[PDB]
Design an enzyme around this catalytic site. Structure first.
Site, mmCIF file in Angstrom:
data_model
loop_
_atom_site.group_PDB
_atom_site.id
_atom_site.type_symbol
_atom_site.label_atom_id
_atom_site.label_comp_id
_atom_site.label_asym_id
_atom_site.label_seq_id
_atom_site.Cartn_x
_atom_site.Cartn_y
_atom_site.Cartn_z
ATOM 1 C CB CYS A 61 -4.718 -27.544 5.199
ATOM 2 S SG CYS A 61 -5.224 -25.895 5.741
ATOM 3 C CD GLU B 209 -1.693 -2.331 2.010
ATOM 4 O OE1 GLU B 209 -2.660 -2.997 2.431
ATOM 5 O OE2 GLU B 209 -0.490 -2.637 2.229
HETATM 6 O O1 LIG Z 1 1.075 -5.625 2.466
HETATM 7 C C1 LIG Z 1 0.894 -6.866 3.089
HETATM 8 C C2 LIG Z 1 -0.358 -7.241 3.574
HETATM 9 C C3 LIG Z 1 -0.460 -8.489 4.184
HETATM 10 C C4 LIG Z 1 0.667 -9.305 4.282
HETATM 11 N N1 LIG Z 1 1.836 -8.902 3.800
HETATM 12 C C5 LIG Z 1 1.983 -7.719 3.214
HETATM 13 BR BR1 LIG Z 1 3.706 -7.137 2.525
#
Ligand SMILES: Oc1cccnc1Br
Length: 282
Positions: free
Chosen positions: A259, A114
Protein backbone atom coordinates in the site's frame (compact mmCIF):
# COMPACT_ATOMS: atom_id res chain seq x y z
CA UNK A 1 -14.96 -20.42 4.54
CA UNK A 2 -12.17 -19.47 2.06
CA UNK A 3 -12.75 -15.87 3.27
CA UNK A 4 -12.98 -17.04 6.92
CA UNK A 5 -9.45 -18.45 6.39
CA UNK A 6 -8.39 -14.75 6.28
CA UNK A 7 -9.95 -14.02 9.75
CA UNK A 8 -7.15 -12.60 12.04
CA UNK A 9 -7.28 -12.10 15.89
CA UNK A 10 -7.52 -8.49 17.26
CA UNK A 11 -4.21 -9.36 19.13
CA UNK A 12 -2.30 -9.30 15.77
CA UNK A 13 -3.57 -5.78 14.84
CA UNK A 14 -2.49 -4.48 18.32
CA UNK A 15 1.15 -5.42 17.33
CA UNK A 16 1.28 -2.75 14.52
CA UNK A 17 -1.42 -0.12 15.38
CA UNK A 18 -1.17 2.79 17.92
CA UNK A 19 -2.60 2.30 21.47
CA UNK A 20 -6.13 3.43 20.25
CA UNK A 21 -6.11 0.46 17.75
CA UNK A 22 -7.22 2.87 14.93
CA UNK A 23 -7.17 0.88 11.61
CA UNK A 24 -7.45 3.88 9.22
CA UNK A 25 -5.40 6.82 7.81
CA UNK A 26 -3.90 9.14 10.49
CA UNK A 27 -3.67 12.94 9.92
CA UNK A 28 -0.11 14.30 10.55
CA UNK A 29 -1.09 18.02 11.02
CA UNK A 30 1.23 19.29 12.27
CA UNK A 31 3.75 16.86 10.65
CA UNK A 32 5.55 16.02 14.00
CA UNK A 33 2.53 14.27 15.69
CA UNK A 34 3.03 10.65 16.89
CA UNK A 35 0.78 8.04 15.15
CA UNK A 36 -1.53 8.09 18.25
CA UNK A 37 -1.86 11.95 18.24
CA UNK A 38 -2.32 11.84 14.39
CA UNK A 39 -5.25 9.35 14.87
CA UNK A 40 -6.97 11.86 17.24
CA UNK A 41 -6.15 14.62 14.65
CA UNK A 42 -7.92 12.52 11.91
CA UNK A 43 -11.03 12.11 14.15
CA UNK A 44 -11.06 15.95 14.66
CA UNK A 45 -10.56 16.55 10.87
CA UNK A 46 -13.76 14.46 10.27
CA UNK A 47 -15.90 15.87 13.17
CA UNK A 48 -14.90 19.55 12.45
CA UNK A 49 -16.60 19.25 8.98
CA UNK A 50 -20.00 18.14 10.45
CA UNK A 51 -21.37 21.45 11.93
CA UNK A 52 -22.09 19.58 15.24
CA UNK A 53 -24.10 21.51 17.91
CA UNK A 54 -24.84 20.45 21.52
CA UNK A 55 -27.83 18.03 21.78
CA UNK A 56 -27.53 16.77 18.17
CA UNK A 57 -27.19 13.01 17.52
CA UNK A 58 -24.14 11.80 15.51
CA UNK A 59 -24.32 8.38 13.75
CA UNK A 60 -20.90 6.64 13.41
CA UNK A 61 -21.15 3.96 10.64
CA UNK A 62 -18.36 1.43 11.39
CA UNK A 63 -17.65 2.84 14.88
CA UNK A 64 -14.53 0.66 15.53
CA UNK A 65 -13.30 0.73 19.18
CA UNK A 66 -15.45 3.86 19.88
CA UNK A 67 -12.68 6.54 19.69
CA UNK A 68 -14.66 8.78 17.23
CA UNK A 69 -17.90 8.59 19.28
CA UNK A 70 -16.08 9.33 22.59
CA UNK A 71 -14.30 12.38 21.04
CA UNK A 72 -17.65 13.63 19.57
CA UNK A 73 -19.39 13.41 23.02
CA UNK A 74 -16.43 15.04 24.88
CA UNK A 75 -15.78 17.85 22.28
CA UNK A 76 -19.32 18.66 20.94
CA UNK A 77 -21.68 17.50 23.79
CA UNK A 78 -23.75 15.35 21.35
CA UNK A 79 -25.64 12.03 21.62
CA UNK A 80 -23.98 9.20 19.61
CA UNK A 81 -25.16 5.99 17.90
CA UNK A 82 -22.46 3.57 16.64
CA UNK A 83 -22.92 0.71 14.13
CA UNK A 84 -20.39 -2.19 14.06
CA UNK A 85 -20.56 -5.84 12.79
CA UNK A 86 -17.82 -6.94 15.33
CA UNK A 87 -19.07 -8.44 18.67
CA UNK A 88 -15.68 -7.49 20.30
CA UNK A 89 -15.86 -3.85 19.02
CA UNK A 90 -19.54 -3.67 20.25
CA UNK A 91 -18.49 -4.86 23.78
CA UNK A 92 -15.59 -2.34 23.90
CA UNK A 93 -17.76 0.61 22.61
CA UNK A 94 -20.51 0.02 25.27
CA UNK A 95 -17.77 0.25 27.98
CA UNK A 96 -15.94 3.21 26.30
CA UNK A 97 -19.30 5.12 26.11
CA UNK A 98 -20.49 4.05 29.64
CA UNK A 99 -17.11 5.37 31.01
CA UNK A 100 -17.89 8.94 29.69
CA UNK A 101 -19.02 11.50 32.33
CA UNK A 102 -22.16 12.88 30.48
CA UNK A 103 -26.03 13.06 30.46
CA UNK A 104 -25.98 12.43 26.66
CA UNK A 105 -27.47 9.28 25.03
CA UNK A 106 -24.77 6.78 23.91
CA UNK A 107 -25.83 3.65 21.93
CA UNK A 108 -23.86 0.96 20.00
CA UNK A 109 -25.74 -1.50 17.71
CA UNK A 110 -24.33 -4.82 16.39
CA UNK A 111 -25.78 -4.25 12.86
CA UNK A 112 -25.08 -2.61 9.47
CA UNK A 113 -26.51 0.70 8.10
CA UNK A 114 -28.94 -1.44 5.94
CA UNK A 115 -31.00 -2.21 9.14
CA UNK A 116 -30.67 1.39 10.58
CA UNK A 117 -33.62 3.80 10.03
CA UNK A 118 -33.60 6.23 13.03
CA UNK A 119 -33.45 10.04 12.63
CA UNK A 120 -29.90 11.44 13.23
CA UNK A 121 -28.41 14.96 12.72
CA UNK A 122 -24.95 14.10 11.28
CA UNK A 123 -23.10 10.99 10.02
CA UNK A 124 -19.40 10.01 10.13
CA UNK A 125 -17.99 6.86 8.44
CA UNK A 126 -14.18 6.27 8.58
CA UNK A 127 -12.92 3.47 6.20
CA UNK A 128 -16.01 1.15 6.44
CA UNK A 129 -17.23 2.16 2.86
CA UNK A 130 -14.63 -0.24 1.21
CA UNK A 131 -16.77 -3.16 2.67
CA UNK A 132 -20.30 -2.09 1.36
CA UNK A 133 -20.03 -3.28 -2.32
CA UNK A 134 -20.73 -1.18 -5.51
CA UNK A 135 -24.38 -2.47 -5.91
CA UNK A 136 -25.22 -1.01 -2.41
CA UNK A 137 -23.92 2.59 -3.08
CA UNK A 138 -27.31 4.06 -4.23
CA UNK A 139 -29.11 2.50 -1.16
CA UNK A 140 -26.34 3.80 1.21
CA UNK A 141 -26.54 7.48 0.07
CA UNK A 142 -30.40 7.39 -0.07
CA UNK A 143 -30.53 6.00 3.53
CA UNK A 144 -27.99 8.66 4.73
CA UNK A 145 -29.91 11.50 2.97
CA UNK A 146 -33.35 10.43 4.31
CA UNK A 147 -32.38 9.88 8.05
CA UNK A 148 -30.86 13.42 8.39
CA UNK A 149 -32.65 16.78 8.80
CA UNK A 150 -32.59 19.64 6.21
CA UNK A 151 -29.15 20.86 7.54
CA UNK A 152 -27.64 17.29 7.55
CA UNK A 153 -23.97 16.59 6.75
CA UNK A 154 -21.93 13.38 6.37
CA UNK A 155 -18.21 12.60 6.05
CA UNK A 156 -17.03 9.35 4.43
CA UNK A 157 -13.26 8.62 4.57
CA UNK A 158 -12.32 5.75 2.15
CA UNK A 159 -9.29 4.26 0.38
CA UNK A 160 -9.96 4.56 -3.39
CA UNK A 161 -8.61 3.21 -6.72
CA UNK A 162 -9.00 4.85 -10.18
CA UNK A 163 -11.31 3.68 -13.03
CA UNK A 164 -9.20 1.28 -15.22
CA UNK A 165 -9.27 4.01 -18.00
CA UNK A 166 -7.52 6.53 -15.63
CA UNK A 167 -5.05 3.78 -14.46
CA UNK A 168 -4.06 2.96 -18.14
CA UNK A 169 -3.18 6.70 -18.67
CA UNK A 170 -0.43 6.51 -15.93
CA UNK A 171 1.39 3.44 -17.49
CA UNK A 172 -0.09 0.06 -18.67
CA UNK A 173 2.72 -1.92 -16.86
CA UNK A 174 1.82 -0.06 -13.59
CA UNK A 175 -1.96 -0.31 -14.42
CA UNK A 176 -2.06 -4.20 -14.48
CA UNK A 177 0.34 -4.41 -11.45
CA UNK A 178 -1.96 -2.15 -9.32
CA UNK A 179 -5.12 -4.07 -10.36
CA UNK A 180 -3.40 -7.29 -9.17
CA UNK A 181 -2.44 -5.79 -5.76
CA UNK A 182 -6.04 -4.49 -5.38
CA UNK A 183 -7.27 -8.10 -6.06
CA UNK A 184 -4.90 -9.25 -3.22
CA UNK A 185 -6.24 -6.58 -0.75
CA UNK A 186 -9.90 -7.51 -1.58
CA UNK A 187 -9.17 -11.32 -1.36
CA UNK A 188 -6.74 -11.72 1.62
CA UNK A 189 -6.89 -8.45 3.73
CA UNK A 190 -10.54 -7.23 3.37
CA UNK A 191 -12.19 -10.38 1.88
CA UNK A 192 -15.22 -9.42 -0.32
CA UNK A 193 -14.21 -5.70 -0.13
CA UNK A 194 -14.29 -3.32 -3.16
CA UNK A 195 -12.20 -0.11 -3.48
CA UNK A 196 -14.49 2.56 -4.99
CA UNK A 197 -13.12 5.50 -7.03
CA UNK A 198 -13.40 9.09 -5.67
CA UNK A 199 -15.64 9.78 -8.74
CA UNK A 200 -18.03 6.95 -7.58
CA UNK A 201 -18.14 8.32 -3.97
CA UNK A 202 -18.93 11.84 -5.36
CA UNK A 203 -21.49 10.90 -8.10
CA UNK A 204 -23.48 8.43 -5.89
CA UNK A 205 -23.70 11.24 -3.28
CA UNK A 206 -24.97 13.75 -5.89
CA UNK A 207 -27.55 11.24 -7.31
CA UNK A 208 -28.99 11.03 -3.73
CA UNK A 209 -29.28 14.89 -3.62
CA UNK A 210 -26.11 15.89 -1.67
CA UNK A 211 -23.83 18.87 -2.46
CA UNK A 212 -20.24 17.47 -2.67
CA UNK A 213 -17.34 19.96 -2.42
CA UNK A 214 -13.85 18.93 -3.63
CA UNK A 215 -12.83 15.80 -1.68
CA UNK A 216 -9.69 16.02 0.56
CA UNK A 217 -6.83 13.67 -0.47
CA UNK A 218 -5.11 12.01 2.58
CA UNK A 219 -2.53 10.22 0.30
CA UNK A 220 0.61 11.70 2.01
CA UNK A 221 -0.85 10.90 5.51
CA UNK A 222 -1.60 7.24 4.49
CA UNK A 223 2.07 6.86 3.27
CA UNK A 224 3.26 8.03 6.79
CA UNK A 225 0.59 5.79 8.46
CA UNK A 226 1.55 2.63 6.46
CA UNK A 227 5.32 3.34 6.99
CA UNK A 228 4.81 3.35 10.84
CA UNK A 229 2.43 0.29 10.72
CA UNK A 230 4.95 -1.74 8.62
CA UNK A 231 7.99 -0.67 10.75
CA UNK A 232 5.99 -1.58 13.95
CA UNK A 233 4.78 -4.99 12.61
CA UNK A 234 8.42 -5.70 11.51
CA UNK A 235 9.77 -4.74 15.01
CA UNK A 236 7.22 -7.28 16.52
CA UNK A 237 7.84 -10.10 13.91
CA UNK A 238 8.61 -12.76 16.61
CA UNK A 239 5.48 -11.90 18.70
CA UNK A 240 3.22 -11.49 15.58
CA UNK A 241 4.28 -14.95 14.18
CA UNK A 242 3.84 -16.41 17.74
CA UNK A 243 0.25 -14.95 17.97
CA UNK A 244 -0.75 -16.03 14.36
CA UNK A 245 1.71 -17.64 11.84
CA UNK A 246 4.58 -16.75 9.40
CA UNK A 247 1.90 -16.81 6.61
CA UNK A 248 -0.19 -14.03 8.30
CA UNK A 249 2.97 -11.96 9.20
CA UNK A 250 4.12 -12.14 5.51
CA UNK A 251 0.59 -11.31 4.20
CA UNK A 252 0.36 -8.12 6.37
CA UNK A 253 3.97 -6.94 5.59
CA UNK A 254 3.10 -7.41 1.84
CA UNK A 255 -0.14 -5.42 2.43
CA UNK A 256 1.48 -2.57 4.46
CA UNK A 257 4.69 -2.17 2.31
CA UNK A 258 2.59 -2.71 -0.89
CA UNK A 259 0.00 0.00 0.00
CA UNK A 260 2.85 2.46 0.91
CA UNK A 261 4.36 1.72 -2.56
CA UNK A 262 1.14 2.21 -4.67
CA UNK A 263 0.14 5.34 -2.61
CA UNK A 264 3.68 6.77 -3.29
CA UNK A 265 3.20 5.84 -7.04
CA UNK A 266 -0.23 7.66 -6.89
CA UNK A 267 -2.10 4.50 -8.18
CA UNK A 268 -4.12 4.50 -4.87
CA UNK A 269 -5.60 7.48 -2.94
CA UNK A 270 -7.57 8.11 0.29
CA UNK A 271 -10.53 10.54 -0.03
CA UNK A 272 -12.36 12.36 2.82
CA UNK A 273 -15.61 13.33 1.01
CA UNK A 274 -18.11 15.77 2.62
CA UNK A 275 -21.83 15.35 1.72
CA UNK A 276 -24.02 18.44 2.41
CA UNK A 277 -27.85 18.35 2.36
CA UNK A 278 -29.44 21.31 0.48
CA UNK A 279 -30.29 23.05 3.82
CA UNK A 280 -26.76 22.60 5.38
CA UNK A 281 -25.30 25.82 6.98
CA UNK A 282 -22.83 27.73 4.66
O1 LIG B 1 -22.88 -1.91 7.30
C1 LIG B 1 -21.51 -2.20 7.21
C2 LIG B 1 -20.99 -2.87 6.11
C3 LIG B 1 -19.62 -3.12 6.10
C4 LIG B 1 -18.83 -2.70 7.16
N1 LIG B 1 -19.37 -2.05 8.19
C5 LIG B 1 -20.67 -1.80 8.25
BR1 LIG B 1 -21.46 -0.87 9.77
Amino acid sequence: DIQAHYDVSDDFFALFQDPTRTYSCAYFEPPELTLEEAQYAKVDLNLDKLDLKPGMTLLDIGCGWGTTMRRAVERFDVNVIGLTLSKNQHARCEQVLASIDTNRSRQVLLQGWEDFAEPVDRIVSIEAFEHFGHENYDDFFKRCFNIMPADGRMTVQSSVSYHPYEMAARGKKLSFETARFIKFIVTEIFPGGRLPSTEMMVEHGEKAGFTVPEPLSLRPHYIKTLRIWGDTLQSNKDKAIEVTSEEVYNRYMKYLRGCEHYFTDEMLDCSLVTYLKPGAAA
